[PDB]
Amino acid sequence: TNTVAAYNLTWKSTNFKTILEWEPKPVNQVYTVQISTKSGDWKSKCFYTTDTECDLTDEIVKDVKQTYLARVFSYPAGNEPLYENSPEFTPYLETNLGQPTIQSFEQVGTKVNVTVEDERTLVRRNNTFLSLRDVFGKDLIYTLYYWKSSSSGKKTAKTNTNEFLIDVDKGENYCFSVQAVIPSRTVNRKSTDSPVECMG
Amino acid sequence: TNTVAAYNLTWKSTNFKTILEWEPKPVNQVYTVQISTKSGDWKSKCFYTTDTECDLTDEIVKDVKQTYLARVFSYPAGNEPLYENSPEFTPYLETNLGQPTIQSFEQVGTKVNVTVEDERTLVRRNNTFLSLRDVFGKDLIYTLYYWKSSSSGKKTAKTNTNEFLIDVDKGENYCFSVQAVIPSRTVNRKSTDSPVECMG
Amino acid sequence: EIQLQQSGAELVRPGALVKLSCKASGFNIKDYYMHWVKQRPEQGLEWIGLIDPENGNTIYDPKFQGKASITADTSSNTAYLQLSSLTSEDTAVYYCARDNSYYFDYWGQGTTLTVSSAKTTPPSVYPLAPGSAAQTNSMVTLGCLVKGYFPEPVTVTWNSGSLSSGVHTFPAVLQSDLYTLSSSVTVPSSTWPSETVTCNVAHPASSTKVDKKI
Amino acid sequence: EIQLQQSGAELVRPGALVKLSCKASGFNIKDYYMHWVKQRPEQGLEWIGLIDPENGNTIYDPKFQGKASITADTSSNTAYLQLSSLTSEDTAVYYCARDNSYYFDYWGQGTTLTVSSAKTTPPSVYPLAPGSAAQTNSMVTLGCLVKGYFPEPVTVTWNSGSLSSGVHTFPAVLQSDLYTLSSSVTVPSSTWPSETVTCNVAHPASSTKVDKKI
Amino acid sequence: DIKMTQSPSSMYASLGERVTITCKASQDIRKYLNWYQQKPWKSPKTLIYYATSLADGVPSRFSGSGSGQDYSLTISSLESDDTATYYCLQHGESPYTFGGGTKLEINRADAAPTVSIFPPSSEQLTSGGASVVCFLNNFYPKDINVKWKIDGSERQNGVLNSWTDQDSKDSTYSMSSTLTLTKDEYERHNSYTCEATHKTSTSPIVKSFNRNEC
Amino acid sequence: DIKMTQSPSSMYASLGERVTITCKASQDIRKYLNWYQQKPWKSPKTLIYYATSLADGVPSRFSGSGSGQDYSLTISSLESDDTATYYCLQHGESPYTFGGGTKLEINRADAAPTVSIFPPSSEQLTSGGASVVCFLNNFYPKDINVKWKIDGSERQNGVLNSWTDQDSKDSTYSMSSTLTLTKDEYERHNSYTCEATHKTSTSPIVKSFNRNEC
């Protein structure tokens, strides 16, 4: 017979929503995906499909800090199957970070209270969806870049909560841009800078 | 001829002591009474009497759970009899329960052991008269209302034996009163309340 | 055969006093002990007191003494429960039961006492027929939207209770003294408009029964 | 595994401009915030400014605006800081750090920037062996006299850093444009000339490395 | 005066599983303990009486053990119509005390809500306001986030939500979301759609309609 | 803009002793304080970050407390390799300000300087100049007076001095005195010796040699 194995197993995830994509497109063949944690009871998930993607979220979400292994078994379509192994994945350290949003911002006197929207993730503790701030905790610093219309040179402000309390120059136009950071990580550390917003 | 049949056949009974009173008073005529269980071999008991009452106890007590049926034949006094039937009687469910009596009572520590007299009944198992409690068993609850002279608001306690062990306040006057309730019934469920009695 | 009846709804002004009733049917209350049990919203059952219609005796939970008084009219086979010096804290559902000595063997449906000043407000029943057959099931989901009423409750039934299987009445929600409840019967596509599906809404606190054909 | 590289030396003529470098190794500078910190001689640390190699953004301490510019080439993983309008006030040591958000977890050793006119002048190393067994310790003291070199610095080590313990390197001392440092190791009498003791001097500003065996 | 202590307040169990609810009284109650079940919006039903007697047609899987101060109800094979609240009521002497009760929620196989959206009945529009209802029936877990978006991301508030109780037959939950704009804002826009995030899917459960009465 | 004021400037304590360095910020910095140790000629090492976290293998004996504007670092059992300079660095919003730093010097058991004298290397002589080096190693107090005498009392000037920093292992100090006569004056005389006045002894520490290349 002849049903090629798989190549280009690529984990793809943002906010813990994970999907394993592979190659090549099925040529008179189906694939079945088996994922387990680190070294283990391999769980078959997406059975005999013909898609080159397998949404493994519900699995990875059971424990974002776990390193998951997966493999695709190349099956002959129509009238010891070979399989390829996926590279390891540690959700907590590799799911990219969605681009942040400035949820709101009102002056609390001499200062401007800027707030970041606490994204919800698919990750679920108990019968509940834990926010992005629920998964990470103190290990999630938001980095603010603000400045005033007047000139190019900017100012920063770190935070590991969701609001900022900056002081700003009376009667001035200030723009904003928030970016997430996962200190603990050695690699997929940042988020895309959020859409710049200005006052008056 | 002319001899009137009966009307007003009433079963009258307390603690299974059953008597059938009826009408009219005999006007130059004698009645004879036939009693059987539920639809059966009739047994005559009150021969050509002139009383408008027949003590059928000996009969009903042989089986208090049965439903007895009876009739009164009207025979012409002096020188196909007419008859009228009695309603059905089911001893266990319609005999009135005699007024209860607190038999005695003496403090047993921080409480006051109260007790009800275990009345005797005509019911005769073996060559013995069974008590009220011997006949009904756990199907006889005694309701005790007690309350302290001082106030108007009462208190209650249930028991399906003959004594209560009610705590009471140190140095106070408490009156008592108790009622018999056959829970199994749907009608003559309660007895009259026992003469109120007080402590110190 | 046997049965206990209650007022269903009752709105009362704070301070005033009220007399719920519970009519007995198919048994004589002078042969049993009538009880009264309250129950407040997010809370469990609470015993108010009892009464022995026979030799007119009553017993009360301490917590209610003075606040309550159970009375019974042995002619009309009715037990009563009059509350007083009313505060919002009396807003709850009152059941009257029947004690055969071993257990409470018959409960009246509940009376829903609401102590408030806000006035009565009959509901507004708006039907919810699809804007076009929905892609969810083979069968279709209709709905009735009871809104702007007060005080509780509103009994929402479909085809006068015949149509029962696919029902889902959702509990009221306060929004400016008035609630909004909502019901949704789900019937086969093959049975509507082929057949008739009416949601009939009852709002007892105002003797209103609205019948909507969707 | 992780590491930041620095020019180490850097003689420059006043008025001129200069771009020092910080080579990253073991991580990707676009995941981090690069920082540059100045430090004059008899003074503590001063923060120049940062750069978020990611979305090419920078932030500077007002004191340095217009004097400096931080730039990064995300290919070669290198951050840069270019001064300008150089005054003597600039002769300092520059360190580049690595902000992980909670702290500067890594530092490039320092680049000793010197703003002068005077010319580079490699060191003259001279051994200092005892004219006779020193009477001071049971063990003996060997020295190295690094003289006439400019600009700073000259890292002095013994046996290419092996013989570490009794080492004393005394700070540079100007004497007409040139410095004079010195270093004196103390080894046991039983190890010299029995064994070899070589003082190795490195003057990075003029790519010289001298090795005097004493 | 004589306190009952029932444990646990709430408890989730899967079908066929066995469960034990408990009641401890602060003194020998002499088996005058009764267990009551209350289905939502229902008068209570008498499960077990006199500590261990099964009552008026109760299933054989119900059983209770006890003596004095320790009492326990146990359901052997937990089933659908057991999602209810259970109370123990001691009725040995005044006052009669119900325990704090416990709510059994049945744990069962996951399920996706089947959605439904209904546009403002013209009838309602005659009044001045408008309520779009989103029905999210038969789902499980009870957990669910719903988002109303009028003309894209511009989502809203002015929404009311209400869940039902575990169905007694399939052990699932239905919801009901209602956004209530007036004819004004209703007509201002065209796209109306609610999103249901529930972990039966990884991508929103969206359902929309457009106000095109043209 | 947001000023940090660290106290004290310098501070001498002794082994085992406890110390507390302090930094007050001109406004709530939200625990964005980090303490840094800088041993001489060394990149800074991050001791505590985020007000109270011990970092990258920092000894347990270091700790810091703080909230708002008040922060303080406390070394519990002062040890030898503590002799360094500490800075606190606020980094919660631009610009990042290092406080001014505090220099910790270890107080310890007095000690006598082991002296060594070195005559001009025949190698340096070729140049035509001469440098006699006197090493005054491992002494405490850092306080010391060194005298160079060329043929009796006729002492001199044209001598350079330089000290080390408190040793990170014995807490003492070394010195270096270098008289730089040219070959001329060098050969003009024969007696060469230095005078060490330190109160470890009451009498001068003298170390001499004669230029007797005969």
Q: How was this structure determined?
A: X-ray
Distance of CA E104 to the CA centre of its chain: 10
Tell me whether residue B161 is exposed, middle or buried, using C-beta atoms within 10 angstroms of its C-beta: 0 to 12, 13 to 18, 19 or more: middle
The residues with which B49 forms a beta bridge, in sequence order, are B31
Q: Which domains does chain D have, with CATH numbers?
A: 1-117 (2.60.40.10), 118-214 (2.60.40.10)
Question: C120 near C178, Cβ under 8 Å?
Answer: no
Distant-in-sequence, close-in-space partners of C145: CB < 8 Å, separation ≥ 6: C125, C126, C127, C128, C180, C182, E118, E121, E124, E131, E133, E178
- Residues E156 and E177: their CA atoms lie apart, in Å, by 12
Specify the amino acid at residue F191. Answer: S
DSSP B36-68: ESSS---EE-STTB-SSEEE-HHHHTT-TTS-B
Same domain assignment for residues B73 and B108:
no
Residue D158 carries which DSSP code?
E
- Residues D203 and D17: their CA atoms lie apart, in Å, by 23
- Residues C113 and C89: their CA atoms lie apart, in Å, by 10
Q: Dihedral sign for Cα A169, A171, A177, A181, please.
A: positive
The residues with which C21 forms a beta bridge, in sequence order, are C80
What is the three-class DSSP state of C96?
Answer: strand
- Residues B138 and B134: their CA atoms lie apart, in Å, by 9
Same domain assignment for residues B71 and B13:
yes
Pairing of β E4-7 and β E97-98: unpaired
Phi, psi of F126, rounded to the nearest 5 degrees: -55, -40
Question: E119 near E193, Cβ under 8 Å?
Answer: no
Q: In chain C, which residues have their Cβ closer than 8 Å to the Cβ of E56?
A: 105
- Residues B102 and B115: their CA atoms lie apart, in Å, by 6
C-alpha angle with apex E46: E40 to E48, nearest 5 degrees?
125
A156 touches chain F (CB under 8 A): yes
Distant-in-sequence, close-in-space partners of B54: CB < 8 Å, separation ≥ 6: B19, B20, B33, B45, B46, B72
Which chains pack against F, by 3+ Cβ pairs within 8 A? A, D
* Residue written as token pair 């007697």: E53
Cα–Cα distances (Å) from E177 to C143, C170, D85, E151, E184, in that order, read: 13, 10, 67, 18, 20
- Residues D41 and F109: their CA atoms lie apart, in Å, by 30
Choose among E142, E145, E202: nearest Cβ to A120: E145
Domains in chain F: boundaries = 1-108, 109-211
Residues of E with CB under 8 A from a CB of A: 141-143, 145, 197, 199, 202
- Residues B123 and D34: their CA atoms lie apart, in Å, by 105
Looking at A94, A126, A158, the residue that finishes a domain is A94
Q: What is the CA radius of gyration of chain B?
A: 22
Question: F152 near F191, Cβ under 8 Å?
Answer: yes
Across the interface, whether the CB atoms of F135 and D131 are under 8 A apart is answered no
Same domain assignment for residues B22 and B60:
yes
Question: E187 near E213, Cβ under 8 Å?
Answer: no
Question: F11 near F102, Cβ under 8 Å?
Answer: yes
Q: Do domains E1-108 and E109-210 have the same CATH topology?
A: yes
Q: By 3-state DSSP, what share of chain B in percent is helix, strand and coil, each rounded to 5?
A: 5, 50, 45
Question: E47 near E73, Cβ under 8 Å?
Answer: yes
Cα–Cα distances (Å) from A32 to A8, A41, A42, A88, C172, in that order, read: 15, 15, 12, 18, 48
Question: E62 near E109, Cβ under 8 Å?
Answer: no
C-alpha angle with apex E176: E173 to E182, nearest 5 degrees?
175
Same domain assignment for residues A81 and A22:
yes
Question: A8 near E193, Cβ under 8 Å?
Answer: no
A and E adjacent (3 or more CB pairs under 8 angstroms): yes
Distance of CA B70 to the CA centre of its chain: 19
F109-211: which CATH topology? Answer: Immunoglobulin-like (2.60.40)
Residue F122 carries which DSSP code?
H
D residues 43-102 closer than 8 Å to A (CB): 50, 52, 54-55, 57-60, 65, 100-102
- Residues C199 and D5: their CA atoms lie apart, in Å, by 79
Distant-in-sequence, close-in-space partners of F188: CB < 8 Å, separation ≥ 6: none
Distant-in-sequence, close-in-space partners of B83: CB < 8 Å, separation ≥ 6: B5, B6, B34, B71, B72, B73, B74
Across the interface, whether the CB atoms of E85 and C44 are under 8 A apart is answered yes
Same domain assignment for residues B51 and B117:
no
Phi, psi of F28, rounded to the nearest 5 degrees: -50, 115
b/e burial code for range E114-149 (CB count within 10 A of at least 16 → b):
bbbbbbbbeebbeeebbbbbbbbbbbbbebbebbbb
* Residue written as token pair 């680190």: A38
What is the three-class DSSP state of B156?
Answer: strand
Same domain assignment for residues B14 and B45:
yes
Q: CA of D171 to nearest chain F CA: how many angstroms apart? A: 6
Distant-in-sequence, close-in-space partners of A159: CB < 8 Å, separation ≥ 6: A116, A141, A142, A143, A144, F30
Residue C8 carries which DSSP code?
S
- Residues D172 and A176: their CA atoms lie apart, in Å, by 49
Across the interface, whether the CB atoms of F94 and A157 are under 8 A apart is answered yes
Pair of tokens at residue C56:
């007119």
Question: E82 near E75, Cβ under 8 Å?
Answer: yes
E1-108: which CATH topology? Answer: Immunoglobulin-like (2.60.40)
- Residues A10 and A21: their CA atoms lie apart, in Å, by 5
Across the interface, whether the CB atoms of B183 and C100 are under 8 A apart is answered yes
- Residues D132 and D138: their CA atoms lie apart, in Å, by 13
- Residues A159 and A172: their CA atoms lie apart, in Å, by 23
Question: D33 near D59, Cβ under 8 Å?
Answer: no
Q: How many CB atoms lie within 10 A of CB F103?
A: 17
Pair of tokens at residue A55:
């949404």
Three-state SS string over chain A comes to CCCCCCEEEEEEEECCEEEEEEECCCCCEEEEEEEECCCCCCEECCCCECCCEECCHHHHHHHCCCCEEEEEEEEECCCCCCEEECCCECHHHHCEECCCCEEEEEECCCEEEEEECCCEEEEECCCCEEEHHHHHCCCCEEEEEEEECCCCCCEEEEECCCEEEEECCCCCCEEECEEEECCCCCCCCEECCCCCEECC
Give the residue from F130, F129, F137, F139 showing the smallest Cα distance to F201.
Answer: F139
- Residues A178 and D34: their CA atoms lie apart, in Å, by 18
Pair of tokens at residue C199:
């949601």
Q: In chain A, which residues have their Cβ closer than 8 Å to the Cβ of D60?
A: 153
Question: F189 near F150, Cβ under 8 Å?
Answer: yes
Cα–Cα distances (Å) from F103 to B129, E47, F21, in that order, read: 109, 80, 10
What is the three-class DSSP state of D15?
Answer: coil
- Residues F44 and F38: their CA atoms lie apart, in Å, by 5
Give the residue from F87, A23, C175, D83 showing the smallest Cα distance to E179.
Answer: C175
Question: E23 near E72, Cβ under 8 Å?
Answer: yes
- In chain D, count H helices and then E strands: 0, 18
Same domain assignment for residues A160 and A190:
yes
Listed in sequence order, the DSSP H helices in chain F are 122-127, 183-188
- Residues E77 and E75: their CA atoms lie apart, in Å, by 6
CATH of the domain at A185: 2.60.40.10
Give the number of C-E residue pairs with CB atoms closer than 8 Å.
130
- Residues C181 and C158: their CA atoms lie apart, in Å, by 14
Helix (H) or strand (E) run with residue E122 in it: helix E122-125
Which CATH superfamily includes the segment(s) E109-210? Immunoglobulins (2.60.40.10)
Looking from the CA of C200 toward its CB, the CA atoms found within 13 Å total 11
Give the residue from E74, E90, E76, E63 showing the smallest Cα distance to E5.
Answer: E90
Question: D176 near D129, Cβ under 8 Å?
Answer: no
Across the interface, whether the CB atoms of A187 and D31 are under 8 A apart is answered yes
Distance of CA A195 to the CA centre of its chain: 18
A110 touches chain F (CB under 8 A): no
b/e burial code for range D181-190 (CB count within 10 A of at least 16 → b):
bbbbbbbeee
Question: F200 near F112, Cβ under 8 Å?
Answer: yes
Question: B118 near B142, Cβ under 8 Å?
Answer: no
Which residue of chain F has the CA closest to A167? F93
How would you classify residue A162: left for phi > 0, otherwise alpha for psi between -120 and 50, otherwise beta?
Answer: alpha
Cα–Cα distances (Å) from E100 to B48, B140, C127, E9, E23, in that order, read: 68, 30, 40, 7, 9
- Residues E22 and E213: their CA atoms lie apart, in Å, by 60
Helix (H) or strand (E) run with residue E183 in it: helix E183-188
What is the three-class DSSP state of E53?
Answer: strand
Same domain assignment for residues B148 and B179:
yes
How would you classify residue A60: left for phi > 0, otherwise alpha for psi between -120 and 50, otherwise beta?
Answer: alpha
Choose among F49, F87, F98: nearest Cβ to D103: F49
DSSP D113-130: EEE-SS--B--B--EE--
Same domain assignment for residues B73 and B107:
no
Across the interface, whether the CB atoms of F92 and A166 are under 8 A apart is answered no
Give the residue from C105, C98, C115 showing the smallest Cα distance to C32.
Answer: C98
The residues with which E4 forms a beta bridge, in sequence order, are E25
Question: D55 near D68, Cβ under 8 Å?
Answer: no
* Residue written as token pair 């019911």: B123
- Residues A160 and F52: their CA atoms lie apart, in Å, by 15
- Residues C193 and B113: their CA atoms lie apart, in Å, by 73
Q: Dihedral sign for Cα B41, B45, B47, B50, please.
A: negative
Interface residue of F43, F56, F139 to substitute, partner D, most D CBs within 10 Å? F43
What is the three-class DSSP state of C100?
Answer: coil
Across the interface, whether the CB atoms of E143 and A124 are under 8 A apart is answered yes
Question: F161 near F136, Cβ under 8 Å?
Answer: no
How would you classify residue A103: left for phi > 0, otherwise alpha for psi between -120 and 50, otherwise beta?
Answer: alpha
- Residues C33 and C104: their CA atoms lie apart, in Å, by 9
Phi, psi of F125, rounded to the nearest 5 degrees: -55, -35
What is the three-class DSSP state of E123?
Answer: helix
C-alpha angle with apex D147: D143 to D153, nearest 5 degrees?
95
Looking at A37, A60, A94, the residue that finishes a domain is A94
Tell me whether residue F203 is exposed, middle or buried, using C-beta atoms within 10 angstroms of its C-beta: 0 to 12, 13 to 18, 19 or more: exposed
CA torsion F52-F53-F56-F61 (nearest 10°) is 60
Domain that holds residue A50: 1-94
Interface residue of C60, C104, C154, C175 to substitute, partner E, most E CBs within 10 Å? C104
Looking at A66, A94, A122, the residue that finishes a domain is A94
Angstrom resolution of this structure: 3.0
- Residues D200 and D211: their CA atoms lie apart, in Å, by 4
Distance of CA E77 to the CA centre of its chain: 21
Pair of tokens at residue D53:
């190699």
Give the number of A-E residue pairs with CB atoms closer than 8 Å.
19
Q: How many CB atoms lie within 10 A of CB E168?
A: 15
Question: A128 near A85, Cβ under 8 Å?
Answer: no
Q: What is the CA radius of gyration of chain F?
A: 23
b/e burial code for range C125-157 (CB count within 10 A of at least 16 → b):
bbbbbbbeebebeeebbbbbbbbbbbbbbbbbb
Distance of CA B185 to the CA centre of its chain: 13
Distant-in-sequence, close-in-space partners of C132: CB < 8 Å, separation ≥ 6: none
Please give the tally of structural domains in chain B.
2
- Residues E35 and E63: their CA atoms lie apart, in Å, by 10
Give the residue from B172, B167, B176 showing the smallest Cα distance to B145.
Answer: B176
Q: Is the peptide bond before B24 cis (omega within 30 degrees of 0)?
A: yes
Helix (H) or strand (E) run with residue B91 in it: helix B91-94
Specify the amino acid at residue D209. Answer: K
Residue B144 carries which DSSP code?
E
Q: In chain A, which residues have their Cβ closer than 8 Å to the Cβ of D57?
A: 145, 154
Listed in sequence order, the DSSP H helices in chain C are none
Give the residue from E100, E87, E99, E11 showing the smallest Cα distance to E43.
Answer: E87
Question: C49 near C60, Cβ under 8 Å?
Answer: yes
Same domain assignment for residues B87 and B110:
no
Q: How many CB atoms lie within 10 A of CB B106?
A: 8
- Residues F125 and F184: their CA atoms lie apart, in Å, by 10
Q: CA of D103 to nearest chain A CA: how many angstroms apart? A: 9
C-alpha angle with apex D154: D151 to D157, nearest 5 degrees?
175
Give the residue from C128, C22, C7, C1 showing the smallest Cα distance to C79.
Answer: C22
